C-alpha cells in the first residue's frame, strides 16, 4: 500500500542512559560484579576472619591455608 506516517514510540531514557542500553549492558555488569568479587576474594585472602568464614571452606585450597603449629610452640 502507501504509508503516509512513520509510527514510532519515544522509548525510555534518562537523558544519556537508555533502557535498551541498560538491557544490552546488564550481563556484562553482572560479569564485572563477579570480577570485582573475585578481586575482593584476592585482596582479602590474608584476613583471618574471611579465611574462617569463606576461604577455608574451599575443597582443595581450604585446609591448605590453615596452620599446624601445636599449642606448645605458640607464645600466645
Amino acid at each position: 500500500a502507501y504509508t503516509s506516517h512513520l509510527s514510532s514510540k519515544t522509548g525510555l531514557h534518562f537523558g544519556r542512559l537508555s533502557l535498551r542500553s541498560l538491557t544490552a549492558y546488564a550481563p556484562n555488569l553482572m560479569l564485572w560484579g563477579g570480577a570485582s568479587m573475585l578481586g575482593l576474594f584476592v585482596f582479602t585472602e590474608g584476613w583471618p576472619k574471611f579465611q574462617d568464614t569463606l576461604y577455608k571452606k574451599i575443597p582443595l585450597l581450604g585446609p591448605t591455608l590453615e596452620d599446624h603449629t601445636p599449642p606448645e610452640d605458640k607464645p600466645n
Binding site: A1, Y2, T3, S4, H5, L6, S8
Partner: protein, 352 residues
C-alpha cells in the same frame, strides 16, 4: 500545478517539484540561492531535524537544487511511501519558518560554502561572467549569493511568496503512479498554494554580442567564448557542442569544455579553454576561434549527438525534442569573450 509521472516496475521513486524561481527571476543578487538553501529547513509544523530523522527511517532523502532557471525540490524514496514525500514537499512550499536564527546559522554558512567552492573554480567564474555579459539583468544575474548587496530575511520571504505560487511550479514523479500522484498532490497544500502568475516569459531574452570581460584570478587560466542562441538555432549549436566535445573534431584536444545551456526561449553555447599557463590558453583559443570562423561540417556528429542528447535527456523531466536533421554547416559569427586568470597574457577580443 501541472502533475506528471512516468510509471516503472522498479523499487525507487523520485519526486520533483520544479519552480520557475532560479537566479534568472531573482529580485536582488542571490535571493534564489538563499531560498534554495532555505528550502528543507524547519516548517511551522515539522522541524528540519524531524524531517531528516523520519525520512531516513521511511527510506528516502531530499535535495534542493538551484538552477539558472528552476528551483528543483527533489525527493528520492522507496516506492510505497509516496504520500509522505508529497506532503513534505507541500509543507516546504506552503509553510517554511524563515527564522532569523536559521538565516544566520544554516543558510548563510551553507551559501558561503557554495560561493567559496564555486569561487575556487575559474571555469564557473568565467561561465557566470559569460552569462552576465551576454544577457544583463535577466539570465545574467549572479547564480550564487556573495554579499555584494544586502539580502535580508524579509526579501527571502517576499521572493518565496512570489515564486512558490500554484501556477509557477510543476510536479513530476519519475517512477510514480500518476493517478495516485494526482490524488496525493490534491488533498494537500499544493492545492492551497496561491494561484499566482507564472514568471515564464515567452519573449526573447535580449542578448548582447561582442562584449568582453576580464577577471584576474590566482590559479588556472581559462578563456571562454559564448554565443547566445535562439529557438530555431538550438539544434545546430547542440551538434556543435557534441562535435567539439567528440573525437571527430581536431580541436577536442585544445577545448577543455563545450556545452549548450538550453532554456524555453533560447540558450547559451559556452566554450571554455582552460590550462595552467596562459601561453597554451592563448595559442589554443586563437586556433579555436580561427578554425571556427572558418566553417565546420557538423553533419558527421549528428548520429553521435542523437545518442548524447538521449543520454542527457533521459534524466530530465522536460525534454525539448530537438530536430538534429537539418543541421549541416557552422561558421562562427559574433561572440562574447571572457578571460579569467593570467589576464595580461590571455588575448583580447580584437586579437581573436
Amino acid at each position: 500545478l501541472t502533475v506528471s509521472a512516468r510509471d516503472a516496475p522498479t523499487k525507487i521513486s523520485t519526486l520533483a517539484v520544479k519552480v520557475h524561481g532560479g537566479s534568472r527571476y531573482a529580485t536582488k543578487d542571490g535571493v534564489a540561492h538563499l531560498l534554495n538553501r532555505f528550502n528543507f529547513q524547519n516548517t511551522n509544523t515539522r522541524s528540519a531535524l524531524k524531517l531528516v530523522r523520519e525520512s531516513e527511517l521511511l527510506g528516502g532523502t531530499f535535495k534542493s537544487t538551484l538552477d539558472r532557471e528552476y528551483i528543483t525540490l527533489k525527493a528520492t524514496f522507496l516506492k510505497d511511501d509516496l504520500p509522505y514525500y508529497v506532503n513534505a514537499l507541500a509543507d516546504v512550499l506552503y509553510k517554511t519558518a524563515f527564522k532569523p536564527h536559521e538565516l544566520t546559522e544554516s543558510v548563510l554558512p551553507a551559501a558561503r560554502y557554495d560561493y567559496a567552492v564555486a569561487e575556487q573554480c575559474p571555469v564557473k567564474s568565467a561561465e557566470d561572467q559569460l552569462y552576465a555579459i551576454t544577457f544583463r539583468k535577466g539570465l545574467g544575474n549572479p547564480l550564487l549569493y556573495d554579499g555584494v548587496e544586502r539580502v535580508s530575511l524579509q526579501d527571502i520571504k517576499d521572493f518565496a511568496d512570489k515564486v512558490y505560487t500554484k501556477e509557477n511550479l510543476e510536479v513530476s514523479g519519475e517512477n510514480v503512479v500518476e493517478a495516485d500522484l494526482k490524488r496525493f498532490v490534491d488533498e494537500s497544500l499544493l492545492s492551497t498554494l496561491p494561484a499566482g502568475k507564472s514568471l515564464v516569459s515567452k519573449s526573447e531574452p535580449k542578448f548582447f554580442l561582442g562584449e568582453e570581460n576580464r577577471v584576474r584570478f590566482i590559479g588556472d587560466s581559462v578563456a571562454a567564448i559564448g554565443i547566445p542562441v535562439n529557438k530555431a538555432s538550438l539544434a545546430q549549436y547542440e551538434v556543435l557542442a557534441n562535435y567539439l566535445t567528440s573525437a571527430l573534431s581536431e580541436l577536442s584536444g585544445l577545448i577543455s569544455s563545450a556545452k549548450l545551456d538550453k532554456f524555453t526561449d533560447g540558450g547559451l553555447f559556452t566554450l571554455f579553454v582552460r590550462d595552467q599557463d596562459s601561453a597554451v590558453v592563448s595559442s589554443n583559443i586563437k586556433k579555436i576561434v580561427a578554425d571556427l570562423k572558418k566553417g565546420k561540417d557538423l553533419s558527421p556528429a549528428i548520429n553521435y549527438t542523437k545518442l548524447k542528447n538521449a543520454v542527457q535527456n533521459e534524466s530530465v523531466s522536460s525534454p525539448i525534442e530537438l530536430n538534429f536533421d537539418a543541421v549541416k554547416d557552422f561558421k562562427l559569427g559574433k561572440f562574447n569573450y571572457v578571460a579569467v586568470g593570467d589576464v595580461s597574457n590571455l588575448p583580447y577580443l580584437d586579437e581573436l
